[PDB]
Design a binder for this molecule. Sequence first.
Ligand SMILES: [Cl-]
Length: 126
Amino acid sequence: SHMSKKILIVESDTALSATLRSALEGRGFTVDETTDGKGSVEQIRRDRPDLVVLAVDLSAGQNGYLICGKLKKDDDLKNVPIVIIGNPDGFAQFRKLKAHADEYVAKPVDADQLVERAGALIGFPE
Ligand SMILES: [Cl-]
């Protein structure tokens, strides 16, 4: 009963992104990943994932709160669901801002909670 549902993981912890990618693929999602936080907004514009998993603390001084802020202010990208993963200390503050994520999963992330959250936002694919 499979139907295509695409996820992009923006994460420079590539061990974690591999773990999450495998877990999501196990439920039938089509999954890509990138370490390129700087390019991520434009990659989302190009590739049009159905959901993005976005880390807070990215390489090269990139920051998932800033990236999500940009996505949510972009009239053509602000409807893409975003799950932020990271140190949970900042999540409540982010929720109070106008431009914020759709869901949050604390690091250390359990791949099951992340898969659960993705499925609850866009449905499973099969
Ligand atoms: Cl992080």
